[PDB]
């Protein structure tokens, strides 16, 4: 089998200023590649074919070149509707056709802290049997950031779950929500809860904390 | 030049044969020399290949897949199908249906528009409203978000607004997600201050056609938490 | 699409004294509106047609004026069959075609306080878990009232229920109902109930209760 | 000089085809040139156009609403008529069947008696009575109100009378307000001095036909106010 590893993970860049996007093979597969473009809710549409070579219709703004296992795309000038994920193919030995994990192509303003807030189970949950904790981070760029749960000092994991939001066509921000699941009792053994996240626009890491 | 159209089931049960036709327009199936092919995508992840039928009478497959996965064609109503037994809640994804016009070889530059292709088992249930009330004791200088949740729900997708589509600002909602029950789980929330929360009405507006269900909710601050 | 409304929303002329109605039009007509005329529980009778036509059996009371956008309907006098809703038709462009939100006819009558009194729920309905409050506003004019409830000096509102009787063939007044559904656990947990009344007749704003 | 007489089967539920028919007396469907028309009227709203037969064959209706409405006319008995495929709850209205005799235009000159179809809850549940008793903490000084409510019924209207009827002075009833259970509430009320409670004992009758229930409640003073 043949591995696709694409770079960076996240590229957040202006419209208007070049970007390049670097793809590496497990195994040389000479110039044998595509690039395609996916935008959420559509199609992949393809962009380069044979590495080099540009698809039909595509403007001459998007170009391509590598060899072996070193490729690499180049756009001229990006556009408003040009951020989306992009995704490496090789065809160097297939079957299995092997795709990159994607590249995800961010704009600006620049980094802001999350505006954040934890939301204590409500009642008709509680009678039921269940209890949820929420952490919400909202207006926060980039989209990185990392949750943790502690109640009252116990180590947890599995426990949790997270989810993102898209970049806002306004604010250009994101928004994360993190639920921790429990039982009715289960969540009245212990008292305290807290939710703790580390972001790049956060000096320090913010703890937030509520009572039982 | 050719237009392709999926379509399929849509709700399977696991364990039975997920079935897919693409249909081809704006010309036959065998039109030239080119290849025929079929793509899957897991929602928030990238896309998979499952197999791809050659002009000649050569068909190829994943070698993960092919135990399970037929792919055949017919000229006589000019179209070709996909076949998967024994499919699992992991097959839940979106299907193309794709060709390679020009030039013989293994990329795809012809697509046709996807299919959501759910297997969870779950008898389409009707939606459950949860009003995310705010809280004054959580509130940060004046501004709060409330919100509404729509819970243990079946199939998609759920129709979720604000005063009937009236309040539109700030409002931001949630793609739904799978539960280990079989069940989704969305979230429609908006910030706003809570001076204005005590003479400007919040309904969550909750239609879900498939169970033909309609519910309206008021979200308002719990008064066992009130500021009394 | 093209859209018009009327004015004004409600109009109180005595019997017996001219009166006038207004109809505008988003975008110019020339003359191509009409005048209906609508009692309850009656279908809609035909008024004026293309303005300043008066159609088959209709007496010269009713006069219709006005072009391009702006169009009026004067009565000499009004007799007492008078009392209706009267709407007003385009045929400038349809299909669609697009109606007036309707205008009432009102008889003049002297500005009268409420007789405000609440039922509190009783028993019968409490055994059902809900509970279901009533306000009575008797024998006031003019219709208009503004109707709030009041719990534990906290407002609740968008949960209730309002009528409007007709009105009255004696003495002209209006009867209002306004009806509060609650749940078992709130009604529980709450121990005064109110409704506040606003109204013409009423020197300041009037809330009657009772405690749980 | 042409009348117009509506029929259908006024109740229904969400999803099936509401049909209407209007026929003509007096006068023919290929009558002169004119137009023949169906619009409707939500209980307590205004009138809503729903289409109109143009005497040549030509049909018009509300773009809105022409996906799912149909006109269609014959002559052999002589009449027109409404089909609205997967009716909803939301289409509860009272319909007219109307035409234009002079001249022809968009107006209409001819009516007939339009009828209310309902399209949520069910023929077969009888009311029950639920007692308005006055108490001495709710007389004002001489001033009582008693009473009877008509609850957990349909379909409306329902017959309500005090003593068999022999009490009509001072009898004051309500219009039915459809609740968000499918069912009707109405009020029957009697205002008088608080000294009437104990010289004449009160009977609330409520006789049902469509479920055939009739129930005779006595209103008595409250039992709450003895010393338990």
């Known amino acids: 089998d043949i591995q696709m590893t694409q770079s960076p993970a996240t590229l957040s860049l202006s419209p208007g200023e070049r970007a390049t996007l670097f793809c590496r093979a497990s195994?040389?597969?000479?110039?044998?590649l595509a690039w395609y473009q996916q935008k959420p809710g559509q199609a992949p549409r393809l962009l380069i074919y044979?590495?080099?070579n540009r698809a039909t219709g595509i403007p001459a703004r998007f170009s391509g070149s590598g060899s072996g296992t070193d490729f690499t795309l180049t756009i001229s000038s990006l556009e408003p509707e040009d951020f989306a994920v992009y995704y490496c193919?090789?065809?160097?030995?297939?079957?299995?056709?092997?795709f990159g994990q994607g590249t995800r192509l961010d704009t600006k303003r620049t980094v802001a802290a999350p505006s954040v807030f934890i939301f204590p189970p409500s009642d008709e949950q509680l009678k039921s049997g269940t209890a949820s904790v929420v952490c919400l981070l909202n207006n926060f760029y980039p989209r990185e950031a990392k949750v943790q749960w502690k109640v009252d000092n116990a180590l947890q994991s599995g426990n949790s779950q997270e989810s993102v939001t898209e970049q806002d066509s306004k604010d250009s921000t994101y928004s994360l929500s993190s639920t921790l699941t429990l039982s009715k009792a289960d969540y009245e053994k212990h008292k305290v809860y807290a939710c703790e996240v580390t972001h790049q626009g956060l000096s320090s890491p913010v703890t937030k904390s509520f009572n039982r | 030049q050719v237009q392709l159209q999926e379509s399929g089931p849509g709700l399977v049960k696991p364990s039975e044969t997920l079935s897919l036709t693409c249909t081809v327009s704006?010309?036959?199936?065998?039109?030239?020399?080119?290849?025929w092919g079929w793509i899957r995508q897991p929602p928030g992840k990238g896309l998979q290949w499952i197999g791809s039928?050659?002009?000649?009478?050569?068909?190829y497959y994943n070698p993960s897949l092919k135990s399970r996965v037929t792919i055949s064609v017919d000229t006589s109503k000019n179209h070709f199908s996909l076949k998967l037994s024994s499919v699992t809640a992991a097959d839940t994804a979106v299907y193309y249906c794709?060709?390679?016009?020009?030039?013989?070889?293994?990329?795809?530059?012809?697509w046709g528009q996807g299919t959501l292709v759910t297997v969870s088992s779950a008898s389409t249930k009707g939606p459950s409203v949860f009003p995310l009330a705010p809280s004054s004791k959580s509130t940060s200088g004046g501004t709060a978000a409330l919100g509404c949740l729509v819970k243990d729900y079946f199939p998609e997708p759920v129709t979720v607004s604000w005063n009937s589509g009236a309040l539109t600002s700030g409002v931001h909602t949630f793609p739904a997600v799978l539960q280990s029950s079989g069940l989704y789980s969305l979230s429609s929330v908006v910030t706003v201050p809570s001076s204005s929360l005590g003479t400007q009405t919040y309904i969550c507006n909750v239609n879900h056609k498939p169970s033909n269900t309609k519910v309206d909710k008021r979200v308002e601050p719990k008064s066992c938490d009130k500021t009394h | 699409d093209i859209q018009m409304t009327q004015s004004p929303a409600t109009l109180s002329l005595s019997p017996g004294e001219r009166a006038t109605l207004f109809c505008?039009?988003?975008?110019?007509?020339?003359?191509?509106?009409?005048?209906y005329q609508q009692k309850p529980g009656q279908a809609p009778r035909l008024?004026?047609?293309?303005?300043?036509?008066?159609?088959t059996g209709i007496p010269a009371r009713f006069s219709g004026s006005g072009s391009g956008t702006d169009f009026t309907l004067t009565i000499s006098s009004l007799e007492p069959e008078d009392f209706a809703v009267?709407?007003?038709?385009?045929?400038?462009?349809?299909?669609?075609?697009?109606?007036?939100?309707g205008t009432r006819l009102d008889t003049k009558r002297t500005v009268a306080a409420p007789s405000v009194f609440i039922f509190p729920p009783s028993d019968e309905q409490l055994k059902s878990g809900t509970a279901s409050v009533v306000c009575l506003l008797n024998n006031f004019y003019p219709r208009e009232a503004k109707v709030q409830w009041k719990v534990d000096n906290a407002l609740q509102s968008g949960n209730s229920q309002e009528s409007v009787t007709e009105q009255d063939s004696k003495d002209s007044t209006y009867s209002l109902s306004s009806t509060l559904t609650l749940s078992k656990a709130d009604y529980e947990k709450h121990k005064v109930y109110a409704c506040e009344v606003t109204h013409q007749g009423l020197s300041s704003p009037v809330t009657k209760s009772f405690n749980r | 000089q042409v009348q117009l007489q509506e029929s259908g089967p006024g109740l229904v539920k969400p999803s099936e085809t509401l049909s209407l028919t209007c026929?003509?007396?007096?006068?023919?469907?290929?009558?002169?040139?004119?137009?023949?028309?169906?619009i409707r009227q939500p209980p307590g709203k205004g009138l809503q156009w729903?289409?109109?037969?143009?005497?040549?064959?030509?049909?018009?209706?509300?773009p809105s609403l022409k996906s799912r409405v149909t006109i269609s006319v014959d002559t052999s008995k002589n009449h027109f008529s409404l089909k609205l495929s997967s009716v909803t709850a939301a289409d509860t209205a009272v319909?007219?069947?109307?035409?234009?005799?002079?001249?022809?235009?968009?107006?209409?000159?001819?009516?007939?008696?339009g009828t209310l179809v309902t399209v949520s809850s069910a023929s077969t549940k009888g009311p029950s009575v639920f007692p308005l008793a006055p108490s001495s903490k709710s007389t004002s000084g001489g001033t009582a109100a008693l009473g009877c409510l008509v609850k957990d019924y349909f379909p409306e209207p329902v017959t309500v009378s005090w003593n068999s009827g022999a009490l009509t002075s001072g009898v004051h009833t309500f219009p039915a307000v459809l609740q968000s259970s499918g069912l009707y509430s109405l009020s029957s009320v009697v205002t008088v001095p608080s000294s009437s409670l104990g010289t004449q004992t009160y009977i609330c009758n409520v006789n049902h036909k469509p479920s055939n229930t009739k129930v005779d409640k006595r209103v008595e003073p409250k039992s709450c106010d003895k010393t338990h």
């Open positions: 044979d590495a080099s």
């Open positions: 195994q040389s597969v000479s110039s044998s």
């Open positions: 704006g010309g036959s199936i065998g039109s030239s020399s080119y290849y």
């Open positions: 039928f050659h002009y000649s009478g050569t068909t």
């Open positions: 193919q090789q065809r160097g030995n297939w079957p299995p056709i092997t």
């Open positions: 794709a060709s390679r016009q020009n030039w013989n070889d293994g990329y795809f530059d012809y």
